[PDB]
């Protein structure tokens, strides 16, 4: 299932590494593990996971 | 050899369709550079991410076309920037700045 | 985003050629980076503009 980043990327373009991080906080309570897709975006970046 | 003469004294039609293909050239060839540097760093496979590219989100020739219309005209849109990883791409965008400046001069002092 | 001298570099070029991919950007947390991002404004568009009269 896919989602929007909720806030501000300290990067302009954030790398997946970044996004899937930043995912994990955002949705899984840290856990990047349960990430299973990213797409970075202008200061933000689209979630998928379950 | 008096070649600059030759271009100030071409009618107007013509002069700009000289600048227009020269500058339309130097985006196509440092376009074929990005391109070939970003499939030769395996930027064009998909790949999970372990790596990171010397150009990021290069996808295509279309996106070396548009990074090298970004780098040339100093747009700089910033979806697809050099990174720090192959120093080619350091080379190549050194390379692609100064004959940048250096047509943009020609072409300004021509129509000057 | 300025993790060794080759991001620096890079940098350099993005603010002195105007280009601003906006990887690595100012901010304003040190003013001496404000105050070398003025003097490296100054000074390209200086030297730019010697440059092109030169050839000009």
Known sequence: IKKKLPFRTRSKFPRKSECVQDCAKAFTNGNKDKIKDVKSEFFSCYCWYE | QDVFTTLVDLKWPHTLLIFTMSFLCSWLLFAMAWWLIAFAHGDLAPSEGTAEPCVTSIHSFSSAFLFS???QVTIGFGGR????ECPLAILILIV??????????????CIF
């Open chain 2, 69 to 71: 219309i970004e780098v």
């Open chain 2, 81 to 84: 920037m050099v990174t720090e």
């Open chain 2, 96 to 109: 692609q700045n100064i004959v940048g400046l250096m047509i943009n001069a020609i072409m300004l002092g």
